[PDB]
Design a protein around this ligand. Structure first.
Ligand SMILES: COc1cc(-c2ccc3nc(NC(C)=O)sc3c2)cnc1OC
Length: 843
């Protein structure tokens, strides 16, 4: 039970979906999975160290990079320590442990055990880890900032308390009985039929259609569709995909083999998703909840159980070629038979695996069988160094096999949380391609999140984002999330509860404002009054005292700085909100500034940011830094989220709007002066020029590779201190934005050259060829990003942009060249397509 039922309500309300509901299910897979996961939760709950769990020390084994060693010119590092306006700086060796450092502190002073928190944050410096390898530290040094730690006592683990828990040879066939809707779309008498497909990870195996019939609110074939595949020859996670044409109006899927390895049997009335008007919402096993409006379709099943010599020379080359080839390059039948026949060779190359395991006739009993024995002798794969790109490839929509996928997930287990985080989003998305609810991957995220509060935090938001936005996959995710919450332990279950109230409260307001200035560019006086009055309404009796900032979970936001809050001047109407730092131990009066937007799909924005981070970290692997600024952004509901405000930055646009703010002339020298005026010391200035030349370079390359490079002035921003950065990626061409205003700071003005520009093209090209060394990773993350992040897309041409862009199948000369040209286009045009934004106002 009873006090165990409030807890359940608490969950659901934390989740945004009632997983005890059963009305949109035609079997128990979810309930079963909810049970399946108790053990792996308990298992990970039990084996987590209380004191390290409660402090979630954020840390990396990666070597410290060259450019940050450069920043320590004394093999020694200063650490200001504090106890209550009593402090001292300490010189400390890059290899020192915290406890160690405690030794030499106790030593210094007085002439039991406390811990080193970061002033202002919920961030601790604990564990047998050398300080060089704590993230916060590395970050401080990047930014030429000091390090301010306060001494306090560890947090009682009691607060992490988890609640007590108390838990044949026949050909295949299917009766298409008929279909129904209530109300008809376009209305004039068109024609309609049912296509039933037998799928295995978008491999289609067999396919049948019905004779067509007049599209009416009821259509009744009562036919057997006898497929050529044998009951036995079916493989696990084979989907019965059923689709409706006239062309494609609806689709819906049924797993032909249930979670219990049971051939599926009986009557089914399925409610079908309509088309928007390929992608992962197509693959789902979920039925459309909205019974009242959806097209449906009745069907029937009753058909029980089921559960090396020397290779030639020139073929080895044919093979090696195939193998050593981008993920999107598709395999000729001749290819596929080659991979298969020389499967034992093919097994010595980890880069093969994707290609190889998609050269499998998964519609044959005897072959899969072999494939499994093929997985048996895993020596080379087990042993191989983790290749995330490789690993990832094997969790996309192209692989349904439970045990192909599982070896990928094996590989991930060897990730440290550091990296778990880089890929966390993509991996969560990748659940969409799991045939079953309960999957290895799902189990792994569950683990990794319960292990480490950082990961858990981000896991929560990621799953909540999706659950709240997608009907196709909310059910499955919600089962996973509940699982997490159950193990995360009340500390957090409060924290999230806190966090969820606020963003619910705030979105409330956010939308009520779009009401009041419809489009009208301007924002009426009245508007700001009301924003102010409501946030006052909110704070005074309803808002929490404070709460973690979801994009940056170490930050406890306090009260609102109402004065500084406002509605942005959008066609949308986002919120510029600012909060006080609830930590009194914090060094600043600076606020936490967060934007709330409705009307953009932030999941795209999120995805991109996360790739940007991935890139920054690739560049870390060549001791390169490009000063990207991937501010925090988090989806929270339907077309709505939050976003980090980056302090002290304006809009390339506005820097024009200032002097002129014309309907739209454009000037070149203006940029540089802006900096001067924001550079109290010329030398600092040159730093802006420094920071800029990188950030510019950084964004130049990345943005191109994603082909989100032709953007407007308004959607690029720069910090007072030189850090340029794009924003807002839900929103003749030009490959990327390299205006002459930029180049005047690089020491050039329309077709010459200069000290910093040589450097710019130098960095650019380093940065470029460096990403090409991780081509497959990007392709695969992009490819997925598109399949899970977007509307509809072409499973060729959309994706195939990026291979042309990374200049696949090229040596590093051809390419560096390729890129250099892509600069010289931006000088042919200068202002041209920039100008062009305005103009189309009427075209
Ligand atoms: C208009 O909403 C968006 C805003 C931003 C965005 C991101 C960071 C940011 N930082 C800013 N700083 C200042 C001082 O104005 S202003 C600002 C705006 C990024 N994406 C969006 O769309 C999803």
């Amino acid at each position: 039970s009873e006090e165990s039922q409030a807890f359940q309500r608490q969950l659901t309300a934390l989740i945004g979906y009632d997983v005890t509901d059963v009305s949109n299910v035609h079997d128990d897979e979810l309930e079963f999975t909810r049970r399946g996961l108790v053990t792996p939760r308990m298992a990970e709950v039990a084996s987590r160290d209380p004191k390290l769990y409660a402090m979630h020390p954020w840390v990396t084994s990666k070597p410290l990079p060259e450019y940050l060693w450069k920043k320590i010119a004394n093999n020694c590092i200063f650490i200001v320590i504090h106890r209550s306006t009593t402090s001292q700086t300490i010189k400390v060796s890059p290899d020192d442990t915290p406890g160690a450092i405690l030794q030499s502190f106790f030593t210094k002073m007085a002439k039991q055990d406390f811990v080193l928190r970061v002033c202002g944050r919920d961030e601790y410096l604990v564990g047998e880890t050398p300080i060089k390898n704590f993230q916060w530290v590395r970050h401080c040094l990047k930014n030429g900032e000091e390090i301010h730690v306060v001494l306090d006592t560890p947090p009682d683990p009691a607060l992490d308390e988890v609640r007590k828990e108390e838990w044949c040879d026949r050909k295949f066939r299917v009766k298409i009985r008929g279909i129904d809707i209530p109300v008809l779309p376009r209305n004039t008498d068109l024609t309609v039929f049912v296509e039933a497909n037998i799928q295995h990870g978008q491999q289609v195996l067999c396919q049948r259609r019905t004779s067509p019939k007049p599209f009416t609110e009821e259509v009744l074939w009562n036919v057997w569709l006898e497929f050529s595949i044998k009951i036995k020859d079916l493989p696990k996670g084979a989907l019965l995909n059923l689709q409706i044409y006239c062309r494609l109006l609806y689709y819906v899927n049924l797993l032909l083999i249930d979670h219990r390895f049971l051939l599926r049997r009986g009557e089914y009335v399925l409610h079908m998703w309509q088309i928007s008007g390929f992608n992962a919402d197509k693959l789902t096993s979920a039925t459309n909840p909205d019974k009242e409006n959806s097209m449906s379709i009745s069907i029937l099943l009753d058909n029980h159980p089921i559960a090396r010599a020397e290779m030639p020379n020139q073929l080895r080359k044919q093979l090696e070629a195939i193998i050593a080839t981008d993920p999107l390059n598709p395999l000729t039948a001749e290819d596929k038979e080659l991979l298969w026949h020389f499967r034992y060779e093919s097994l010595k190359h980890p880069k093969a695996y994707p290609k190889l395991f998609s050269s499998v006739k998964w519609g044959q009993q005897e072959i899969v069988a072999k494939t499994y024995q093929l997985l048996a002798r895993r020596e080379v794969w087990d042993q191989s160094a983790l290749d995330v790109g490789l690993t990832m490839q094997l969790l996309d929509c192209n692989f349904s096999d439970e045990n192909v996928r599982a070896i990928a997930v094996q590989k991930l287990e060897s990730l440290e949380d550091d990296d778990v985080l880089h890929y966390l989003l993509q991996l969560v998305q990748a659940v969409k391609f799991e045939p079953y609810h309960d999957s290895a991957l799902a189990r792994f995220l569950l683990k990794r999140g319960l292990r480490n509060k950082r990961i858990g935090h981000f896991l929560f938001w990621f799953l909540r984002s999706e659950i709240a936005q997608s009907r196709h996959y909310q059910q499955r995710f919600a089962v996973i999330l509940e699982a997490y919450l159950r193990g995360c332990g009340t500390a957090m279950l409060h924290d999230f509860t806190q966090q969820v109230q606020v963003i619910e409260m705030l979105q409330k307001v956010t939308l009520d404002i779009k009401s009041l200035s419809a489009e009208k560019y301007d924002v009426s006086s009245q508007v700001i009054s009301q924003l102010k009055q409501k946030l006052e309404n909110l704070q005074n009796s309803q808002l929490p005292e404070s709460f973690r900032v979801p994009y940056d979970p170490g930050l406890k936001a306090g009260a609102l700085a109402i004065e500084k809050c406002k509605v942005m001047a959008s066609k949308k109407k986002p919120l510029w909100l600012e909060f006080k730092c609830a930590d009194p131990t914090a060094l600043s009066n600076e606020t936490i500034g967060i934007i709330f937007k409705h009307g953009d799909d932030l999941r795209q924005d999120m995805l991109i940011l996360q790739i940007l981070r991935i890139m920054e970290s690739i560049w870390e692997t060549e001791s390169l830094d490009l000063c990207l600024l991937p501010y925090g952004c988090i989806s929270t509901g339907d077309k709505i989220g939050m976003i980090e405000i980056v302090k002290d930055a304006t809009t390339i646009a506005k820097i024009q709007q200032s002097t002129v703010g014309n309907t739209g002339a454009f000037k070149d020298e203006v940029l540089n002066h802006w900096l001067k005026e924001k550079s109290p010391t010329e030398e600092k200035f040159q730093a802006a020029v420094e920071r800029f030349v990188y950030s510019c370079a950084g964004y130049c390359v990345a943005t191109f590779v994603l082909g989100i490079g032709d953007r407007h002035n308004d959607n690029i921003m720069i910090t007072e201190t030189g850090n340029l950065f794009h924003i807002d990626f839900g929103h003749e061409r030009v490959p990327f934005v390299l205006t002459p205003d930029f180049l005047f700071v690089m020491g050039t003005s329309g077709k010459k050259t200069s000290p910093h520009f040589q450097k710019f093209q130098d960095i650019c090209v380093k940065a470029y060829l460096a990403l090409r060394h991780h081509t497959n990773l990007l392709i695969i993350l992009f490819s997925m990003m598109l399949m899970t992040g977007m509307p509809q897309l072409t499973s060729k041409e959309d994706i195939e942009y990026i291979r042309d862009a990374l200049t696949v199948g090229k040596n590093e000369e051809d390419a560096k060249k390729y890129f250099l040209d892509q600069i010289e286009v931006c000088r042919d045009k200068g202002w041209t397509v920039q100008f062009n934004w305005f103009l189309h106002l009427v075209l």
